[PDB]
Amino acid sequence: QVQLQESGPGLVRPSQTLSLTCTVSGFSLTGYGVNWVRQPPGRGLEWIGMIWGDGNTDYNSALKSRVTMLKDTSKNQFSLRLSSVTAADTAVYYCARERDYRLDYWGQGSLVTVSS
């Protein structure tokens, strides 16, 4: 079939650097984009950015200052790294496949709660 899957630290201590894996598998890592959207609870969906099958990436100007997306060609997975995380970043992270101007396949994100 076709699937992605956030995994990772459910809780992060503020000032730190949060990070998640998105393990895809059912499509190719190069002819497909992996988009990353988060959504602080009660608040709606927001577009973090997106990494391409070539490693290049497009950030969302609020998070450019601290987000970072990688890809592990060798393991069907993509990495997202937020930094100097604060309570304003506690939310559910989603990785999804953008295929033809649509994000057809989403993981069922993993919640991350920052706090001391």
């Binding site: 959207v37 709606g44 969906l45 927001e46 577009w47 950015g49 497009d58 100007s61 994000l103």
Partner: peptide
């Protein structure tokens, strides 16, 4: 349920308020 739209004409692929 809640419904959100998000254009793709260009990056950044923004979303509706929902």
């Amino acid at each position: 349920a809640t419904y959100y739209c998000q254009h793709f004409w260009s990056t950044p692929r923004t979303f509706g308020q929902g």
